[PDB]
Amino acid sequence: LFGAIAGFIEGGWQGMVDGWYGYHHSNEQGSGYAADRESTQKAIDGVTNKVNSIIDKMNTQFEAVGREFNNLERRIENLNKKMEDGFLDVWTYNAELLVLMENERTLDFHDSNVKNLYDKVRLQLRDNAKELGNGCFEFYHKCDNECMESVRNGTYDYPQYSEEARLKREE
Amino acid sequence: LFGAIAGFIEGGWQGMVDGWYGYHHSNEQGSGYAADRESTQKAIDGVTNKVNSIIDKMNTQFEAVGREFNNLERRIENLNKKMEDGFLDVWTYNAELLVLMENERTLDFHDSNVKNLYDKVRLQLRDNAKELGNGCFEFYHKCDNECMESVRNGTYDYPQYSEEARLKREE
Amino acid sequence: LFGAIAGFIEGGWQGMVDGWYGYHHSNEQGSGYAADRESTQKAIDGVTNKVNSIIDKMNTQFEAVGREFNNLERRIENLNKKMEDGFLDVWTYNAELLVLMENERTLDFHDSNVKNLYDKVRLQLRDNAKELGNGCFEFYHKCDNECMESVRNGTYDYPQYSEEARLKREE
Amino acid sequence: DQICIGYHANNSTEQVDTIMEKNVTVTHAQDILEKTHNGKLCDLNGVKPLILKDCSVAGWLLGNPMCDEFIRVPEWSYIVERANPANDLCYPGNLNDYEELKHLLSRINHFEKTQIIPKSSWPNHTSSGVSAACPYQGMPSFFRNVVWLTKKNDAYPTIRMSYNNTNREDLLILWGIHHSNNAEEQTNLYKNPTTYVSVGTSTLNQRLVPKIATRSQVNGQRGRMDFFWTILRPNDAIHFESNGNFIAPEYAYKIIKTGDSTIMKSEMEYGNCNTKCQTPIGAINSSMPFHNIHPLTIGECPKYVKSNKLVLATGLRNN
Amino acid sequence: DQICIGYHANNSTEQVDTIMEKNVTVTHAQDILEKTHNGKLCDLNGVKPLILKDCSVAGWLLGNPMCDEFIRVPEWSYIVERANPANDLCYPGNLNDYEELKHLLSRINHFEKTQIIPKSSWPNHTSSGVSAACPYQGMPSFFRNVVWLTKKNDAYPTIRMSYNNTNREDLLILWGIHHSNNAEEQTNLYKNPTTYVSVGTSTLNQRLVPKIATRSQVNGQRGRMDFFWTILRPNDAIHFESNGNFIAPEYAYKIIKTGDSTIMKSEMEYGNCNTKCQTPIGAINSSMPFHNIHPLTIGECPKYVKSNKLVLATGLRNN
Amino acid sequence: DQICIGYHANNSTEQVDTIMEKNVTVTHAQDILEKTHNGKLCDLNGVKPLILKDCSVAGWLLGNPMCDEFIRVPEWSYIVERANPANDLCYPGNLNDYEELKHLLSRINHFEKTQIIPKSSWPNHTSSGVSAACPYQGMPSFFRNVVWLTKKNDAYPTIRMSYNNTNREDLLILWGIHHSNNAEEQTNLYKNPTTYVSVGTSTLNQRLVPKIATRSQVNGQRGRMDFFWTILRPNDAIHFESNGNFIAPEYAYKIIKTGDSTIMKSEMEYGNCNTKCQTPIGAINSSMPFHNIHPLTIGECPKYVKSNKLVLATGLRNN
Ligand SMILES: *[C@@H]1O[C@H](CO)[C@@H](O[C@@H]2O[C@H](CO)[C@@H](O)[C@H](O)[C@H]2NC(C)=O)[C@H](O)[C@H]1NC(C)=O
Ligand SMILES: *[C@@H]1O[C@H](CO)[C@@H](O[C@@H]2O[C@H](CO)[C@@H](O)[C@H](O)[C@H]2NC(C)=O)[C@H](O)[C@H]1NC(C)=O
Ligand SMILES: *[C@@H]1O[C@H](CO)[C@@H](O[C@@H]2O[C@H](CO)[C@@H](O)[C@H](O)[C@H]2NC(C)=O)[C@H](O)[C@H]1NC(C)=O
Ligand SMILES: *[C@@H]1O[C@H](CO)[C@@H](O)[C@H](O)[C@H]1NC(C)=O
Ligand SMILES: *[C@@H]1O[C@H](CO)[C@@H](O)[C@H](O)[C@H]1NC(C)=O
Ligand SMILES: *[C@@H]1O[C@H](CO)[C@@H](O)[C@H](O)[C@H]1NC(C)=O
Ligand SMILES: *[C@@H]1O[C@H](CO)[C@@H](O)[C@H](O)[C@H]1NC(C)=O
Ligand SMILES: *[C@@H]1O[C@H](CO)[C@@H](O)[C@H](O)[C@H]1NC(C)=O
Ligand SMILES: *[C@@H]1O[C@H](CO)[C@@H](O)[C@H](O)[C@H]1NC(C)=O
């Protein structure tokens, strides 16, 4: 567990319909939601690939053929049924267990993606904003909607806003 | 691996008998240990759930029935023995391997829980304290025992001490 | 995934031939690469141990014996084939699936080791340097090649350089 | 002045399970377990199964007079036999190597029966034999593909006759022997008191002899009939020689299509449906990769598992 | 002024393993492999097993005179047979379909033996047959459940007799035939030189004939006895007819309880213990989910694995 | 002034796969699948296999004249039989319990053939029997290990003879019976019209009788020969008794080494190579833990998997 989903981000957003992960901004021109298209597409790619992997990997399984034995063949009748039952018990262990394990790994995959997005924004902003520790960054300057879009598409010029942020940290 | 247990916290505490994870405080009224029961209960819940899962998953396994064959039935005698031996080799692979894999993931589960607790305190204190990088936070003010209990049960008011911490980071 | 390899460290180094992880330094006496002997030996130990584990655990597998049946024994001939084919389908599921799963965990193991190294020096340096968020620390003082060697072998005296960095952060 | 990182949540109630936590709501699941069937027996790619309602395989192949629907069966996809069919060996006895025959019959999709030895071919013997054990429309009768030879002008001259498989295909040939109850019945039906039936091909070298002894009454008969079968290969010939108790072939089956099939034991009736996946308890219209319906599948089908539920998480934990 | 985050450590030496690292000390393990048994054969929910020390199943069922301890056995939980018991077919020969009979036996828990054909029933034959191959108290004897019929007043009139199963239960019936050594012994014991044994039920249609030929000496006997068995269903009847070499039933076994059991090959002795889990080499008092003791378990038991060690980590790495 | 943390990259193109992502270039892979064989059959730790070329096991064992190369075979490691060998039962018939004999052979490494009953041993019978079905150098011949006894001075006096296994090891003994075509051939070869072959050991009690009837022509013969075998254990004896149609042993096989082997069906030829791992389609010089070559391995070998590729990632993602 990477401590982000249901961790320091104490809940999901009913409001973000475009994707799995993303941003919610609020400046003086209002507020809104924007999904992060690249980290959402990477996750849907890896998860449909994992599902196809599980299905393709249990393609060659076991098929129980019907065989019949008479009243003085009960030994190999019993052998046959314990063999077919054994192979199906085995393959249902395999299926149930693989589903459990990769469900756990899928939930933690999503968790990791969320923490990596939070971090990638943290690294851009540094002391230009204040980590509230709830998943939000309270800016130290004036981030209008172009500035927000920069933060989103990764093109946030840290020098440009240094000075005014520099002062309200002091004051 | 999440780098906390046997990582930047280079050792466990013989002194914390109340739980798996927790806090050790030291102020001028003395020192002590306190287990973090909420993240300890979450872990003991999830790990007894994992153990019960592992036991329940190998409920339907393979039972070897004793069958017998005469001197001109050696072909199916050999078939029978290779079948029973095959199913037992298979199920002991399954058992040993599942134990190994979820032992690895249990150790890393504990690791993650510890790092998430360290972080949960880091986020509360920020620059009011100094991360020594050994698992400890050297405060910048005077945290009596009620200040400590607040840090533990999560109710640490950051405004109240800002000014005072502000000064010895100062000086 | 721990977001370091192919994450905030946007690429590997063709130039570091001596090991898997390590440092690249640049001061006024020049630049260079130095692998981290410790973290690298730890990983090569754990991964050759994992490989030997995977090989040794598939020691007792299934061995197919050749049996033969006549024209009025087609029922148990078919039984025999379904049994041997079933056990081989089972063990190739086991092999391919174990390889896939521990390949994923090996890649993420390497990732974790890298993040733990980045962190281990971050914890040494604190505000004496500036995390560029690209995997590098832009120092705030004068780190000659023995200061660098200290950072590498872990012996970095934070007091000694505080004062000087203290100014070049201000100014 | 703020910006936050967050993740999807929605109304979804989809639960998935893990080793650590059960009943975990997620935003996007995916079921991979098909758990519904149509409770009917269907075609298989538009090929109707052979459903021997109330007639067993022995009764069909030997020609029980109650099995007259199956005189000329068309090509089938699979065969459906009931649990305890009523019409099977009206005259009591055995179809020897029956299970091996059913296993052979599960790799055959089309018979064309053919008359290898017409009743016209027994000038010196009586071929009108008939039994009360095999009623047809209230009168005694007998298997339709096989002839009960008896004495004529109070003689059973020894039969020496062969049939050479001129056809392209393999031939399934059934014949039999009759175990009489005592010396006097044995002499009444055939004149000769100690008899035999010899059958020879290129692989087969059989000598059968009546066991004249007292048995329990079954279908009103203490006598018995032991039937045998072989696969006469093309250009090979079969050589019968008897002096009593011989039950001769008249009709044999040309094996003309030999693809993939099974003999499925279901008590169910035809459904007028079609399917790509049939099971004893119903068919399957599904592109799930698994089902829990029945293990004895036939056709292009998911893989049978015993689980009650299999859902893969694709999304995030939701609240 | 300080506060730190840390984790448990203690004295524990419990090691666990992982794919990356072996012999890893942890604070809290959990063993799930039972590796201990009591080396004894016990009751199974208070029901004592049937231990045929030194008598084999054939010797028991036919009534070897050294097996008199098992004349009237009480209900059992499982059956314990030794690897090479001494008392088994004193008169040499075969119990035909023996393995199928033992497989039938491991699903029976209680026989009640019953006298279907008393020795009183052979007015025209000698029923006192006895062999040196079957000593009892130093004198020659014979199987107790089965009667060696021989000639009387230098005649062996042909036997025609039947037994009708009036009982509620299935009947396990054994009979046999005797292979003599030459024409002269054949005439000494039975007058008729060429003989037969005919057996008929509703399913069975047997004719046995003595093989009079020279064999190797076994238990001091070149003659042989071939024994056969069947399950006579309630209201069905069995019809014997012989004129020599017949070894007739006297006692049959009512199958009165038909639950679950096994035939366990152990050289061990009774332990006066009780258990819910029995193995050939000892019983198991354990609520572990696995054991490595023996694969051929009986009762509510852990699941057999070959491992020497299975420990689940529940706590943290400890130092 | 700067210091950075980084990781290895190199030229490597080695790809590995995972559940989430396929075709992931890494810096350090490791192959664990052996996919190469030498396409030829070799020694096995310097012990040459027995390669019956155009002779089947039956042919070799009975002593078919074309299989004269295996008169006295040296110790083998495994046995190689072709898919459809030409020299097998020149005189048509059956080697009864053939499959069980092959299974017994797959656990034997060395026979020493021995003359238990020389042709010298039949003073009152003709032992020169010979058939056109078994040509040798253009003239009719017969199995070399087994003798066709026929009448002499127009008599076939009944045979009574035994052989006591004095050797220290088990003996594989084959004998047979001949099914003639009609009463007059039966009288031409043996004077007596109705005959038998009795075989007895301490365990075996066989009576064979010719089935004189008309069969299909096979290798120019409507007659047949049914062969049987047994393992005469040391100090036990075998007792033959016939008055016609007996085909007697002359040579038997001492089972002198009884290790580990298999009967491998390969059409291939000897390779003059050596190996520690042989398969039907070639041998293996490899220390990989897996292969995908062929399932029916023999020797110290990797474990067969059906996979086409198996590489474990050991290094990092590379670009
Ligand atoms: C079965 O009948 C066919 C029909 O003729 C026989 O086939 C002939 O066999 C002879 C061998 O003597 C060949 O030379 C001919 O080529 C075959 N004739 C045709 C038209 O193909 C066959 O021999 C008979 N077999 C038996 C066992 O009676
Ligand atoms: C065995 O004896 C019983 C005698 O009870 C026979 O059963 C009777 O069968 C008649 C039909 O003939 C029925 O009326 C009754 O149901 C039976 N009688 C009783 C009292 O239940 C049975 O037929 C005999 N079986 C054989 C093979 O002789
Ligand atoms: C086969 O011959 C051996 C001797 O060559 C027989 O074994 C002897 O048996 C006698 C008793 O009859 C005892 O003196 C010894 O037990 C054996 N002697 C030796 C020297 O071994 C054996 O009985 C014969 N087998 C048959 C079936 O006749
Ligand atoms: C999980 O949810 C199902 C849904 O009804 C319920 O029946 C079951 O009892 C639950 N089990 C647990 C352990 O929560
Ligand atoms: C049998 O049929 C043949 C040919 O039809 C004939 O020659 C003969 O008279 C008949 N009767 C007997 C007993 O052969
Ligand atoms: C692990 O510890 C046991 C304790 O006896 C020892 O026998 C074994 O050799 C050790 N194995 C390794 C790989 O350390
Ligand atoms: C013995 O045989 C005679 C003649 O068949 C018969 O009357 C008698 O009843 C039989 N046994 C006895 C004495 O009951
Ligand atoms: C993976 O690489 C192989 C290499 O040839 C290629 O054939 C295959 O199509 C690739 N698969 C995918 C899913 O890209
Ligand atoms: C062969 O026959 C002669 C004369 O009957 C007899 O003396 C001799 O013992 C017989 N040989 C055998 C092997 O019995």
Side-chain angles (χ1 to χ4, degrees), chain F residues 219-235:
Chain F
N219 298 346
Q221 292 294 322
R222 297 170 184 280
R224 294 282 187 278
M225 279 184 196
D226 282 326
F227 291 99
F228 302 85
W229 62 272
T230 205
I231 301 307
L232 188 57
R233 276 208 91 218
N235 266 53

Side-chain angles (χ1 to χ4, degrees), chain A residues 16-82:
Chain A
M16 200 174 48
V17 295
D18 302 332
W20 275 335
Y21 329 110
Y23 319 87
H24 166 68
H25 85 258
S26 165
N27 56 18
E28 310 306 332
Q29 308 132 283
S31 70
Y33 288 112
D36 186 53
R37 300 311 330 198
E38 254 172 40
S39 81
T40 279
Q41 200 63 235
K42 195 33 62 214
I44 188 164
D45 280 14
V47 152
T48 44
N49 288 36
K50 146 181 291 192
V51 168
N52 291 351
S53 274
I54 289 145
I55 302 167
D56 298 22
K57 282 283 130 276
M58 305 197 140
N59 173 45
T60 82
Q61 212 194 265
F62 179 82
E63 219 180 340
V65 173
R67 286 164 214 100
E68 252 164 305
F69 308 92
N70 64 49
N71 194 247
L72 277 190
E73 277 174 330
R74 303 222 162 284
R75 273 168 315 134
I76 58 185
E77 184 178 49
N78 177 261
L79 194 161
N80 182 78
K81 186 214 30 178
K82 279 271 138 279

